[PDB]
Design an enzyme around this catalytic site. Structure first.
Site, PDB file in Angstrom:
ATOM      1  N   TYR A  27      -3.826  11.212  -0.809  1.00 16.87           N
ATOM      2  CA  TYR A  27      -5.366  11.501  -0.993  1.00 16.87           C
ATOM      3  C   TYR A  27      -5.690  12.730   0.108  1.00 16.87           C
ATOM      4  O   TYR A  27      -5.018  12.805   1.193  1.00 16.87           O
ATOM      5  CB  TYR A  27      -6.262  10.576  -0.872  1.00 16.87           C
ATOM      6  CG  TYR A  27      -6.584   9.862   0.342  1.00 16.87           C
ATOM      7  CD1 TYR A  27      -5.855   8.755   1.070  1.00 16.87           C
ATOM      8  CD2 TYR A  27      -7.568  10.510   1.164  1.00 16.87           C
ATOM      9  CE1 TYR A  27      -5.960   8.175   1.969  1.00 16.87           C
ATOM     10  CE2 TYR A  27      -7.711   9.766   2.290  1.00 16.87           C
ATOM     11  CZ  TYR A  27      -6.987   8.773   3.078  1.00 16.87           C
ATOM     12  OH  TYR A  27      -7.294   8.284   4.067  1.00 16.87           O
ATOM     13  N   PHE A  37     -11.828  16.119   6.250  1.00 17.42           N
ATOM     14  CA  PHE A  37     -11.961  14.952   7.353  1.00 17.42           C
ATOM     15  C   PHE A  37     -10.925  14.058   7.287  1.00 17.42           C
ATOM     16  O   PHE A  37     -10.740  13.104   8.298  1.00 17.42           O
ATOM     17  CB  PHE A  37     -13.390  14.363   7.280  1.00 17.42           C
ATOM     18  CG  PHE A  37     -13.811  13.422   6.039  1.00 17.42           C
ATOM     19  CD1 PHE A  37     -13.259  12.341   6.038  1.00 17.42           C
ATOM     20  CD2 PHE A  37     -14.034  14.043   4.778  1.00 17.42           C
ATOM     21  CE1 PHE A  37     -13.445  11.529   4.757  1.00 17.42           C
ATOM     22  CE2 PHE A  37     -14.376  13.401   3.831  1.00 17.42           C
ATOM     23  CZ  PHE A  37     -14.058  12.079   3.827  1.00 17.42           C
ATOM     24  N   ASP A  38     -10.167  13.864   6.306  1.00 16.07           N
ATOM     25  CA  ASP A  38      -9.182  12.616   6.304  1.00 16.07           C
ATOM     26  C   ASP A  38      -8.026  13.190   5.177  1.00 16.07           C
ATOM     27  O   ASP A  38      -8.464  13.752   4.049  1.00 16.07           O
ATOM     28  CB  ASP A  38      -9.506  11.382   5.853  1.00 16.07           C
ATOM     29  CG  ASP A  38      -8.551  10.275   6.285  1.00 16.07           C
ATOM     30  OD1 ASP A  38      -7.540  10.556   6.928  1.00 16.07           O
ATOM     31  OD2 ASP A  38      -9.073   8.954   5.755  1.00 16.07           O
ATOM     32  N   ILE A  57     -14.352   2.877  -0.167  1.00 22.98           N
ATOM     33  CA  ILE A  57     -15.676   2.967  -0.457  1.00 22.98           C
ATOM     34  C   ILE A  57     -15.809   2.865  -2.291  1.00 22.98           C
ATOM     35  O   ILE A  57     -14.878   2.963  -3.002  1.00 22.98           O
ATOM     36  CB  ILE A  57     -15.988   4.353  -0.245  1.00 22.98           C
ATOM     37  CG1 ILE A  57     -15.348   5.393  -0.839  1.00 22.98           C
ATOM     38  CG2 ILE A  57     -16.335   4.577   1.185  1.00 22.98           C
ATOM     39  CD1 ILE A  57     -15.408   7.015  -0.302  1.00 22.98           C
ATOM     40  N   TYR A  83     -20.561   6.701   2.303  1.00 14.49           N
ATOM     41  CA  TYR A  83     -21.000   6.266   3.712  1.00 14.49           C
ATOM     42  C   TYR A  83     -22.578   6.156   3.865  1.00 14.49           C
ATOM     43  O   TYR A  83     -22.989   5.949   4.787  1.00 14.49           O
ATOM     44  CB  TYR A  83     -20.434   6.690   4.611  1.00 14.49           C
ATOM     45  CG  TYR A  83     -18.884   6.932   4.679  1.00 14.49           C
ATOM     46  CD1 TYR A  83     -18.187   5.547   5.425  1.00 14.49           C
ATOM     47  CD2 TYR A  83     -18.145   7.408   3.988  1.00 14.49           C
ATOM     48  CE1 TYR A  83     -16.787   5.681   5.081  1.00 14.49           C
ATOM     49  CE2 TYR A  83     -16.613   7.519   3.801  1.00 14.49           C
ATOM     50  CZ  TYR A  83     -16.020   6.511   4.373  1.00 14.49           C
ATOM     51  OH  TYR A  83     -14.549   6.242   4.282  1.00 14.49           O
ATOM     52  N   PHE A 100     -12.952  13.843  -2.943  1.00 21.53           N
ATOM     53  CA  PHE A 100     -11.524  13.440  -2.806  1.00 21.53           C
ATOM     54  C   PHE A 100     -10.594  13.964  -3.970  1.00 21.53           C
ATOM     55  O   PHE A 100     -10.858  13.945  -5.267  1.00 21.53           O
ATOM     56  CB  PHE A 100     -11.406  11.734  -2.684  1.00 21.53           C
ATOM     57  CG  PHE A 100     -12.184  11.137  -1.630  1.00 21.53           C
ATOM     58  CD1 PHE A 100     -13.377  11.094  -1.644  1.00 21.53           C
ATOM     59  CD2 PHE A 100     -11.315  10.878  -0.429  1.00 21.53           C
ATOM     60  CE1 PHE A 100     -13.932  10.459  -0.493  1.00 21.53           C
ATOM     61  CE2 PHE A 100     -11.992  10.354   0.522  1.00 21.53           C
ATOM     62  CZ  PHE A 100     -13.340  10.127   0.606  1.00 21.53           C
TER      63      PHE A 100
END
Length: 108
Positions: A27, A37-38, A57, A83, A100
């Site tokens: 991912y 961010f990830d 999430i 979030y 994502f």
């Protein structure tokens, strides 16, 4: 809004994650402006989570459940499925819609 699923590449179209199964994915997570961010790909190691255990999430729980094994798809997740108002200060801003890129590699 919850989660929107938009296909990138087709899976087998037959095998979808069920409760209690472990999803093995790669991912990339980005903010709505496109800033990453990830990413499991930048760690070169797939990410595993168990469907229904709320280890991810809500947008992942209900979005990845709609994907077939082998599928790559774009999940666009509103903050309530994400979030929320609080976000994760320093990483995820308040009220953030997230995008994502997720590939479901296999189920375990």
């Amino acid at each position: 809004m919850g989660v929107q699923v938009e296909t990138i590449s087709p899976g087998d179209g037959r095998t979808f994650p069920k409760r209690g199964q472990t999803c093995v994915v790669h991912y990339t997570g980005m903010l709505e402006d496109g800033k990453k961010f990830d990413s499991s790909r930048d760690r070169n190691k797939p990410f595993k989570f168990m469907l229904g255990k709320q280890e991810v999430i809500r947008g992942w729980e209900e979005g990845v459940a709609q994907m077939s094994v082998g599928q790559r798809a774009k999940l666009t997740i509103s903050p309530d499925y994400a979030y929320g108002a609080t976000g994760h200060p320093g990483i995820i801003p308040p009220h953030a819609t997230l995008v994502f890129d997720v590939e479901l590699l296999k189920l375990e």
